[PDB]
């Protein structure tokens, strides 16, 4: 896939080819450069994920000093940084946020019974 | 005023001292991280590392309103409390408050 010049963290090589490349600290996904890079002395430890160039946080759905505590149900994402909108009638997939309703609930936020 | 002890030296010919990128002085050294612009810290967050905000000590979660469980202290619960469950740790410093008739740095003695 090729890079969108209007995409996130896309830069231009100042080499004479002047072709599109990810800006420093980012890697390409599809048409933009939205994968942060954590390498060298800032490489992410076990049970951590890279969230910003050179910055790691506990993996999605976990928090704590060893990234081993499970987020309570009202949160998702790394370090529980995201709010789960279907709590308490469901819980959110830790990495995507997608709602998993309890047994007899439905709706985008699990707001409806039966 | 500035101690050459996160202190850097300017690229200019003045060869004067300055805080290294991302840090500010509060006294004689530069140990205040900088959180600015789009990386400014929200309510109940603190800047801990340049361009990084975390929930204030003893709290975590999307609105930094959940209190850490007892085995942790510090911002976003990043620190381990060595005296849990025989004591509790001060959220910002970690200092143990041992339970009744317990002692030691980690409340390890009955």
Author numbering:
A (entry chain B): 20 to 133
B (entry chain A): 21 to 25, 28 to 132
What is written in the article reporting this PDB entry?
Its ectodomain has three glycosylation sites and contains multiple EGF-like domains, which usually has a two-stranded β-sheet followed by a loop region and three conserved disulfide bonds. Here, we solve the crystal structures of the N-terminal fragments of human SCARF1, which show that SCARF1 forms homodimers and its epidermal growth factor (EGF)-like domains adopt a long-curved conformation.
Among them, two fragments (f1, 20–132aa and f2, 20–221aa) were crystallized and the crystals diffracted to 2.2 Å and 2.6 Å, respectively. The initial phasing for f1 crystal was done by SAD using Pt derivatives and the structure was refined to 2.2 Å with a native dataset after molecular replacement. The crystal of f1 fragment belongs to space group P212121 with two molecules per asymmetric unit. The electron density of the N-terminal end (~21–62aa) of one molecule in an asymmetric unit is relatively weak and some residues are missing, probably due to the flexibility of this region. In the crystal of f1 fragment, two molecules in an asymmetric unit are related by a twofold non-crystallographic symmetry axis. At the dimeric interfaces of f1 and f2 fragments, hydrogen bonds are formed between S88 and Y94 of the monomers, and F82 and Y94 are also close to each other, thus may form π-π interaction. But the salt bridges are not found in f2 crystals, suggesting they are not required for dimerization. By contrast, mutant Y94A, where the hydrogen bonds and the π-π interactions between Y94 and F82 were both removed, showed a significant elution volume shift and the volume corresponded to the molecular weight of the monomeric SCARF1 ectodomain, suggesting that the π-π interactions between F82 and Y94 were important for dimerization.
